[PDB]
């Protein structure tokens, strides 16, 4: 085929329309569905695919017990077309407790991290075969975007972090051509902690709105140029910070160059993208927990520091329903690049003690230039009807 170039202008976005939903947990109560966590969506030139880090077991299984651990040898990257639930026929494309997948227009590239926490191996699988691999350069938990990577003209950039989750970690941007690591640029700029980046193509560059797990409740931005392999980094300018935990809307802040040091000890994977000078950002409705999910546009939120003027707010998941990792992915339209996002709806441990398992279902929204209504799309599974 032909390499994806992403050389189209960003699509006109007035909001996000519902696109897909797997109902994984609801189907798990009477079917054989994989236990999954940290899902993401990536699209071929033809169709879009779900991805998730399966826990090596199904829900109606004795091994689903104690599935809240992030890194086990049995975790694998599941893969099927968007909408198809993760049933027993799902293809496990690699062993990974951390993953990232992009389609360069010709073949799939999967970056899969597995192994020991302190000696992890990151395998680069392109076109169904292992092409490259790297080891942990910091001898800590080597991790990656946990979302789709972006290939521009055949060069796929993946953001790999290695180091403390609550301190200074070494983040490197790896440039991958047909599975081979052709360049490795260290993270540069004013972002002090970069982890779980939601990358989207901004030609000729790649923009990654990452998660600051150390000090910032404002998401760091990593701009990556796929031509000269140059990295710059800053923080999202909007005063409506998109990382939970966070302060409430009145007291939150962001000044585009430093973490705000407001409830930044933890974080959730999230997304943001610039509609010109505005920012379209999704965040959990609850400030402290991953409960609910909303998306809105902050006027001048990508340029003006501490901008709190929001518009076009949509409630994706209502306040009283659990959410989780969110992320972005891009679809190449007829003449314009559409920005779509997904929300992971985590159910089970540790928040819900009725069951012994931790799993999730995904819901996907695509940006639209037309009109839309309202509604909430939670997981919908009754935890009392689910197997323990």
């Amino acid at each position, epitope marked *: 085929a032909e390499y994806r170039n992403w*050389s189209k*202008p960003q699509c006109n976005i007035t909001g996000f329309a519902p696109f897909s939903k797997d109902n994984s947990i609801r189907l798990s109560a009477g079917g054989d569905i994989w236990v999954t966590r940290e899902p993401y969506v990536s699209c071929d030139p033809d169709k879009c695919y779900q991805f998730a880090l399966g826990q090596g077991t199904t829900l109606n299984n004795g091994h689903s017990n104690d599935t809240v651990h992030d890194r086990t040898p049995y975790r694998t990257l599941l893969m099927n077309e968007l909408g198809v639930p993760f049933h027993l026929g799902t293809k496990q494309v690699c062993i990974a407790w951390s993953s990232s997948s992009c389609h360069d227009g010709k073949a799939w590239l999967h970056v899969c991290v597995t192994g020991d926490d302190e000696n992890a191996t990151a395998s680069f699988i392109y076109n169904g075969r292992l092409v490259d691999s790297i080891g942990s350069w910091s001898k800590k938990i080597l991790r990656t975007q946990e979302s789709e990577c972006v290939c521009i003209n055949g060069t796929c950039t993946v953001v790999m972090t290695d180091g403390s989750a609550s301190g200074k970690a070494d983040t490197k941007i790896l440039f991958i051509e047909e599975g081979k690591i052709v360049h490795t640029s260290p993270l540069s*700029g004013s972002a002090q902690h970069v982890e779980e980046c939601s990358c989207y193509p*901004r030609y*000729p*560059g790649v923009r990654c709105v990452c998660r600051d797990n150390w000090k910032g409740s404002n998401r760091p931005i990593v701009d990556i140029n796929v031509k000269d392999y*140059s*990295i710059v980094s800053s923080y999202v300018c909007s005063g409506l910070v998109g990382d939970t935990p966070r302060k409430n809307d009145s007291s939150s802040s962001s000044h585009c160059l430093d973490p705000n040091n407001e409830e930044g000890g933890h974080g959730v994977k999230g997304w943001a993208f610039d509609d010109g000078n505005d920012v379209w950002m999704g965040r959990t409705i609850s400030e402290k927990l991953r409960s609910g999910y909303e998306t809105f546009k902050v006027i001048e939120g990508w*340029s003006k*520091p501490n901008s709190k003027l929001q518009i076009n707010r949509q409630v994706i998941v209502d306040r009283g329903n659990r959410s989780g990792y969110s992320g972005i992915f891009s679809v190449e339209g007829k003449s314009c690049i559409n920005r779509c996002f997904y929300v992971e709806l985590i159910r089970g441990r540790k928040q819900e003690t009725e069951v012994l398992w931790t799993s999730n279902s995904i819901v996907v929204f695509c940006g639209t230039s037309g009109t839309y209504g309202t509604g909430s799309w939670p997981d919908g599974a009754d935890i009392n009807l689910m197997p323990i």
Partner: antibody
Amino acid sequence: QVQLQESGPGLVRPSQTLSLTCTVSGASISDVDFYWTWFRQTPGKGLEWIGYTNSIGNAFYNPSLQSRLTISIDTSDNHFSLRLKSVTAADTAVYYCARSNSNTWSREYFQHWGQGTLVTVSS
Amino acid sequence: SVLTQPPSVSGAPGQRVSISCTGSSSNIGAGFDVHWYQQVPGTAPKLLIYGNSNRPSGVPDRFSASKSGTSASLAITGLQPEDEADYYCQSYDNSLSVNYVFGTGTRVTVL
């Protein structure tokens, strides 16, 4: 050959919106391999980079002025524009429209320039 | 931020002069290419050197450039008339975002 021609009002009141347009001749701005750049040179200082853009609309702005400007593109009329908000006595300068060599960032030099328009902010 | 240059550098015809641009950690000292622009006052700047020495076209062989560490130098050999202009060193700055820093501006005055 690429020819750039700045065109905009020469006098803008303070706290108004400065708007300049650079018309490009001899080349198409609709090919996304060049950055269509804006510069300004205050009389007492050197050149200052204002912002970037290409035909696709992926713009980069000077972090100092980033809160104000908006660099737009128009592939139909074959021109790109600059829009500075809330101008002051520091915004009076000679504004140059230029084209970068390529679409990189670290390896960028601006060979093709405009003629330069004197924009004065005063009353 | 900006790069620094001597405010003025003079020189008689025939001899040579040097313009010293000094960078920083997110600057000339980060390995980014240094480009030199010649601007006769009142007119548009003209690109003189790129790649720290790659005189594009129609540029006299008098001008030479060299980068070392966090400093870069532009050498004019000959100091002929019509070389009386402002010379600016441009470089890429990545401390905050995509940024391009110019030199303070050296005025070459051929006595």
